[PDB]
Amino acid sequence: MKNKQHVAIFPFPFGSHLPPLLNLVLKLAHIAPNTSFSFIGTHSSNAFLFTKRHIPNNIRVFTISDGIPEGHVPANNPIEKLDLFLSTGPDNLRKGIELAVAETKQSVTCIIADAFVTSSLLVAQTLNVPWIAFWPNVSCSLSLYFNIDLIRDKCSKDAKNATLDFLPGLSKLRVEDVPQDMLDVGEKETLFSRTLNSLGVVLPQAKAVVVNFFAELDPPLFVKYMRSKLQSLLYVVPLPCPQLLLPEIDSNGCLSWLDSKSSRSVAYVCFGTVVSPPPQEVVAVAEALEESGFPFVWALKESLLSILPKGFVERTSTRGKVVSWVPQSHVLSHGSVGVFVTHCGANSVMESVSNGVPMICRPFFGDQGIAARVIQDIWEVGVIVEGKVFTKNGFVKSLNLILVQEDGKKIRDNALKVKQIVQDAVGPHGQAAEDFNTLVEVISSS
Ligand SMILES: Oc1cc(O)c2cc(O)c(-c3cc(O)c(O)c(O)c3)[o+]c2c1
User: Fold this and answer.
1) Which residues cross the membrane (predicted)?
2) Would residue 114 show up in a list of annotated catalytic residues for this protein?
3) What residue owns the CA closest to ligand 1's atom 17?
4) Do 302 and 373 belong to one domain?
5) Are residues 196 and 242 in the same domain?
6) What angle do CA 268, 273, 275 make, to 5 degrees?
7) Which of 13, 239, 348, 382 has an alpha carbon within 20 to 30 A of 19's alpha carbon?
8) How far is the CA of 83 from the centre of ligand 1 (A)?
9) CA dist., res. 289 & res. 76, Å (int)
10) What is the torsional sign of CA 119, 123, 124, 125?
11) 9: closest CA among 443, 445, 431, 444?
12) Is 212 annotated as contributing to ligand binding?
């Protein structure tokens, strides 16, 4: 009997959403090389993932429209390109299905999609195939989308530090931690925010929701709450397949530099690639790092080097490293690094907790506030920076708290505890090993 299993994959075709979904498909393709996997991205998303990278033969790549007509020049806001792609609707997605079906000579039996591509559910219902939502964001933020009205009401009437006790297992979350686009109503509403606010109705229609995290780190009561909202909640280990890793030269020499530093002494600073921080906070970070006297690695966009204080890089050159790029995963897995100063992106938090690195948190948007709140008040593996924004005096204090002070021993200890929890979670028989097979069974039973 000919194997006719054909999984269509729909990533949210942007930056940090692309690698974790490729990582999952690679694992699925390795264990089911008889099954066809059709990865359907845009021209720019495909170039990002597959330019110089060898992929298994049962994974084929197809290209659909990015929603940007030739001639148009999107503004300098990270939402427009998202809205433009989402505006393409299911019809653009079905054009990717056409290219997949034509190539493989197989009708799609299953669809795995990033939860943000809500149009792919209509596609799944049209084809009558199971729809599997993939969730590479902050896991604990899944609960929010089932209580939008409760949250919108509380965010307008209650205090900003009021607890969201109506969320099982997430009573530490506050009004000020809630994503802004979830509260935005009317003119401020984007196609992106309207899509995210549809998750509470969209997600229960998914055959399975695959979370890119460790189930053992999430609050058990939150987990049970989500299992009560969904047909199936599956956790697959977010750690990279060796098929995903593209080994490259450490051009900056971060690791060689880190080897000359002592254990848990280095501050690693990075705000991500989507985040455009105010120049004054950028000035404040440099000022704090310099005053603190701690060794540091700061991954900073070169477009921001002119913003840096005069002589800062030159004066800190003997104890600090300011570079355009770092192999972050290798840096966070280095023993010299004592604190991760982060914007709290889901992947960065993942890499920091799995390596036992405490965090200084400055969330900017989205679900970074949820991550930061979990890091400080639940896992207790870090602190939100003093004042919610970067200042010289507040940041230095956070740096001193985590790195050297006895008042930060509970946090450094908790970071080691969490690392051990992760190491057992990724074991041969943690929850994810069982959940990975369940997902494989869903695909082979489709
Ligand atoms: O409220 C939220 C909750 C979430 O989980 C989010 C996750 C995300 O990845 C993004 C996101 C991703 C991008 O690549 C962008 O260019 C951008 O402007 C936003 O926004 C989010 C907003």
Assistant:
1) none
2) yes
3) 78
4) yes
5) yes
6) 95
7) 382
8) 11
9) 29
10) positive
11) 443
12) no
DSSP 287-323: HHHHHH---EEEE--GGGTTTSPTTHHHHSTTTEEEE
Strands 266-270 and 6-10: unpaired
Experimental method: X-ray
Do residue 330 and residue 224 come from a single domain? no
Amino acid identity of residue 6, one-letter, is: H
Length of the chain measured in residues: 446
Closest CA to 268 of 329, 215, 191, 317: 329
The distance of Cα 334 from the centroid of its chain, to the nearest Å, equals 21
Rounded to a whole number of angstroms, the CA Rg of the chain reads 22
Q: Which residue has the tokens 């639940």?
A: 378
Same domain, 277 and 358: yes
Q: Tokens at residue 441, please? A: 């069974």
Q: Establish whether residue 274 lines the binding site of ligand 1, counting it when its CB lies within 6 angstroms of any ligand atom.
A: yes
At CB < 8 A and 24+ separation, what contacts does 149-156 make?
151/178, 151/182, 151/183, 152/182, 152/183, 152/185, 155/183, 156/183
Rounded to 5 degrees, φ, ψ at 345 are: -70, 145
Fill in the amino acid letter for 195.
Answer: T
- CA dihedral 132→138→140→141, nearest 10 degrees, is -80
Q: Return the structure tokens found at 348.
A: 């960065």
Nearest protein Cα to ligand 1, atom 20? 366
Q: Give the resolution value in Å.
A: 2.5
CATH, residue 160: 3.40.50.2000
